[PDB]
């Protein structure tokens, strides 16, 4: 996450109405807060309607966009065709499904 | 499979070298087959190992 602060050309975003988006909004951390403000004011719309749209957009991006999502969804895409996405960095928070 | 064929062909030349004793190039032809068969066996081993690394 810190490496994102080191640059501004590469964009990133989070899914709408999803836990991840709510985490940045209420994150009282020095690095996570910064990210919440970068994306809210960034044009065009980085908050994709669904995960399917976001992943495809990153594929066509060729590297100018990074998609922020949960690890579980980040393991049935790196091992599925055309196999053109990779997870960089550990996890930011420990959560679970219910 | 090619190595098996060449070894079989070489055997015939050796077998035929007891009827046409006057002819001498038959024995040479057998030598080429057995040497060529060995070179084909090298390729087969290399391909088999290389494929299993996929």
């Amino acid at each position: 996450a810190e490496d994102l602060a080191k640059q501004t050309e590469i964009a990133y975003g989070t899914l709408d109405s999803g836990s991840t988006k709510e985490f940045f909004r209420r994150s009282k951390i020095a690095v996570y807060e910064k990210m919440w403000t970068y994306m809210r004011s960034a044009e065009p719309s980085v908050f994709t309607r669904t995960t399917a749209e976001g992943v495809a957009r990153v594929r066509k991006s060729k590297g100018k966009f990074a998609f922020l999502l949960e690890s579980t969804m980040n393991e049935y895409i790196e091992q599925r065709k055309p196999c053109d996405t990779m997870k960089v960095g550990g996890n930011l928070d420990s959560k679970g499904y219910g | 499979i090619l190595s098996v064929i060449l070894l079989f062909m070489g055997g015939l030349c050796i077998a035929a070298s007891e009827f046409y004793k006057t002819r001498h190039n038959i024995i040479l032809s057998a030598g080429i087959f057995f040497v060529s068969a060995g070179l084909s066996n090298i390729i087969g081993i290399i391909v088999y190992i290389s494929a299993n690394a996929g």
Binding site: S94 | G38, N41, I42
Partner: protein
């Protein structure tokens, strides 16, 4: 008793007495190349000769 939500994540694991680092084998000079390459070099040596 009424448990609460997991505050941390664990999992069964095997603990063993840390086996001291080993000494490279007596024939460690063959390590840089796989056993297949050494076998094929011998075949190439015979074939070329």
């Amino acid at each position: 008793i009424d448990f609460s939500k997991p505050f941390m994540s664990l999992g069964i694991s095997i603990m063993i007495k840390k086996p001291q680092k080993s000494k490279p084998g007596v024939f460690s000079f063959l390590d840089p190349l796989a056993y297949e390459i050494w076998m094929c070099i011998v075949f190439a040596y015979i074939g070329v000769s």
